[PDB]
Design a protein around this ligand. Sequence first.
Ligand SMILES: Nc1nc2c(ncn2C[C@H](COCCP(=O)(O)O)COCP(=O)(O)O)c(=O)[nH]1
Ligand SMILES: Nc1nc2c(ncn2C[C@H](COCCP(=O)(O)O)COCP(=O)(O)O)c(=O)[nH]1
Ligand SMILES: Nc1nc2c(ncn2C[C@H](COCCP(=O)(O)O)COCP(=O)(O)O)c(=O)[nH]1
Ligand SMILES: Nc1nc2c(ncn2C[C@H](COCCP(=O)(O)O)COCP(=O)(O)O)c(=O)[nH]1
Ligand SMILES: [Mg+2]
Ligand SMILES: [Mg+2]
Ligand SMILES: [Mg+2]
Ligand SMILES: [Mg+2]
Lengths: 204, 206, 205, 204
Amino acid sequence: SPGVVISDDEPGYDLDLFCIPNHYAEDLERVFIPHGLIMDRTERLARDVMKEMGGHHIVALCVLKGGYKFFADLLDYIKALNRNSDRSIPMTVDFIRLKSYIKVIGGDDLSTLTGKNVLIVEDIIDTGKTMQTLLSLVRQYNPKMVKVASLLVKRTPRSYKPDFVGFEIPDKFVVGYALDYNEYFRDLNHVCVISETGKAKYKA
Amino acid sequence: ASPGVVISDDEPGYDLDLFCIPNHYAEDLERVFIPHGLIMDRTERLARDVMKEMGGHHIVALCVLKGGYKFFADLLDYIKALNRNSDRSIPMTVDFIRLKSYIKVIGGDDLSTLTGKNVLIVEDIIDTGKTMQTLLSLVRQYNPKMVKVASLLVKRTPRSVGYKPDFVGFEIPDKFVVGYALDYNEYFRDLNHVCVISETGKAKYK
Amino acid sequence: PGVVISDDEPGYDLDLFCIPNHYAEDLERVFIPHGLIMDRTERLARDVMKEMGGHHIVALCVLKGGYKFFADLLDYIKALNRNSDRSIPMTVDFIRLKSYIKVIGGDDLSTLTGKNVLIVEDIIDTGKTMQTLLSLVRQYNPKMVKVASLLVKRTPRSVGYKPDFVGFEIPDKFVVGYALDYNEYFRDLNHVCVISETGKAKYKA
Amino acid sequence: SPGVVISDDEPGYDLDLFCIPNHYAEDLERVFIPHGLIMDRTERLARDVMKEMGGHHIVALCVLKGGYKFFADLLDYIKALNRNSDRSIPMTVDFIRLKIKVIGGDDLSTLTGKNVLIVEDIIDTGKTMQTLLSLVRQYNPKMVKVASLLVKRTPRSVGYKPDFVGFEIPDKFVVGYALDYNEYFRDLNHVCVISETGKAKYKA
Ligand SMILES: Nc1nc2c(ncn2C[C@H](COCCP(=O)(O)O)COCP(=O)(O)O)c(=O)[nH]1
Ligand SMILES: Nc1nc2c(ncn2C[C@H](COCCP(=O)(O)O)COCP(=O)(O)O)c(=O)[nH]1
Ligand SMILES: Nc1nc2c(ncn2C[C@H](COCCP(=O)(O)O)COCP(=O)(O)O)c(=O)[nH]1
Ligand SMILES: Nc1nc2c(ncn2C[C@H](COCCP(=O)(O)O)COCP(=O)(O)O)c(=O)[nH]1
Ligand SMILES: [Mg+2]
Ligand SMILES: [Mg+2]
Ligand SMILES: [Mg+2]
Ligand SMILES: [Mg+2]
């Protein structure tokens, strides 16, 4: 499954139809994915993750910063399953950053991943090359399995497909739900599209 | 004064496999029409819209059972979230009614409790608008200070008598839907999403 | 037998929580934080399905005080049902109770026959109301009648009835909030709390 | 305020009165602080934070790993305020580890002239925050505040008190809500005390 497919001819939602951060009022164009829809999709993903990555000890890797929201909510939904049903597994967590100029900064020593079920949690897959690099590096420390859950996957001329996908989006730049534009819009609950005012206001 | 979130006749919905669904309704549903989380988001905005307009005086929130109960609880929860985090809040009392076509209200408090009060009527869906017009005609006999109507769903239909509610969640096609307290012969009320029933479902719960 | 709140529990200071602004002078202490109610209700929903999930459940809400507990209990029940391999469909109903007991509103009682009935209440005080309601329900031969009550009081006035599901066992004190009222007020409050003398005078009939 | 005070005699809550992670069934002793209680308290803290820090751009710093849950929940309640009020402020986020040496995170020059909120899971001796504060002040933020879910009552306290406190607890070892015992129990909803069995089970 490619996840929830949002087509190119999606107009999104008018800002005035939802509760939007006041300081971003004139900065956003449309709401592209409402927060509540992300939650419903993530709930289902949590059940698929446990069904696939059970029942050995899971190491959950959060790719900071954009992955932090999806990570926290996904784990919360996984927590809901483990405390309300039989058949569960203990989970440890770790948080990493990926550097360019490929380079894993932060997180524990990668030997912790050895012989374990590693769940990598991403915000978005664009070209897919970043995850290919990370998976190759991770694969050298020999785990039981390694899976990738990405909130977003872009339809675009690019290389990879994650094991768990929330939404398949058009080739547009989106912010919100921890996804950023120059560090901004992480403090936004919905996934949205920036306006021209916003891009110039928070330009680097 | 928005018509709410507009869902067009072209909207196909979502595959059931993309969401978590009641296991006992797996064969009884065709598509997810409005995800539960989308409802909450819209309902959150509606709560702020209601207080902007009705927060000036004491509110009597009137729930139209049974289909209205979920939208009533969630709306009030979001209104309460505002009232315990702002300097501007107003007391609220609640009451529940059931409308039987025999047109006639049933099992409520004395409607004199509406006199001089700001009444918020909460419904699940408005189709022709005849039911609400009737209810309002009865309510206005008791001279409320103000009477407003919040409806989760408003259908686009030529059968409409022209009545428009004050607060609208979603403007939907002229199609039968269930879930979120809306029912098909008392079934699907235990459904969290708003959905379209399958041929298998309507045959089993006929 | 549920979460026991002893007689000497002082509760919580008002300024430590988020409180309805129009009730700021009307409340004394927070007795049961909203989140605690949710946590306890979550477990109760699993206990309900463990005993009653084997057959079609008819859920009866006792208006008005039960409306919050009813909605939240069913939400957790639904959360279970959309994540399990097995579940049974639920139909809901809402009733009000009166004397001269007489069930006001709701469907025909014949809809309860052969079904697993869950009566959802806000509180059990003397228990006389539930004893009477249960005696009426039994007449229509349901498969099973169970009662979920959020609150049970430790009171000498208790006739001796205990519900099958209990959220909290509270002292013999008057509490408001979470759909529980004082002359129709405080239903618009998600914490179970203790009224102040200021509030008791302001809102008295 | 010292926050919600938990006494020394508080026995907590029986395990089978709540929904508990199935794999920690005999590893916990009692539920110390129910998750829902943490939420209500965190909600009030969010309002307190915004009233003191909402006058200017906020940079929220999460002290991984233990602070991650309190961080995400606190920021969510803050977001609820900001999308429902007529006045709010942009917030950027950052994640750090402490080994004073800051492990990971952006250049500390990003804190200059901004309202810095450091988010912790627990204050014990208070040494960790004091040294971090004395370092952060040297980058000249507009202000710097500290929110901690937990503050322990202990004679070896250097006397430091955070600006925002969730709960004041006795000198007991607690786990859950991202707090760990040898990297375990981070996948737990409530704050709890481990049993004798669990303590030996996950012995480092
Ligand atoms: N916030 C946001 N970021 C986007 C978007 N598209 C690509 N990116 C950058 C994606 C993430 O951000 C890059 C730098 P960062 O993680 O330090 O913020 C790139 O994915 C890696 P790959 O699969 O190899 O191309 C987007 O629509 N929104
Ligand atoms: N569950 C469901 N019910 C629908 C739908 N359309 C009309 N109805 C009947 C709804 C009410 O039917 C009466 C039975 P009830 O209120 O006891 O459930 C809407 O009425 C609105 P109006 O035409 O303006 O008087 C629908 O798509 N789903
Ligand atoms: N708000 C509130 N109501 C209380 C309380 N104790 C009894 N009641 C009234 C309870 C309800 O009686 C009438 C109130 P209602 O018509 O609003 O439901 C007593 O429970 C029934 P029983 O077991 O037969 O004694 C209390 O502490 N707070
Ligand atoms: N999980 C847990 N950790 C506890 C506890 N008490 C102190 N700690 C260690 C707290 C953190 O130290 C452990 C290192 P870590 O951040 O890598 O987990 C002490 O707070 C810092 P300070 O105020 O300067 O003394 C506890 O009850 N549970
Ligand atoms: Mg990323
Ligand atoms: Mg209706
Ligand atoms: Mg009652
Ligand atoms: Mg810490």
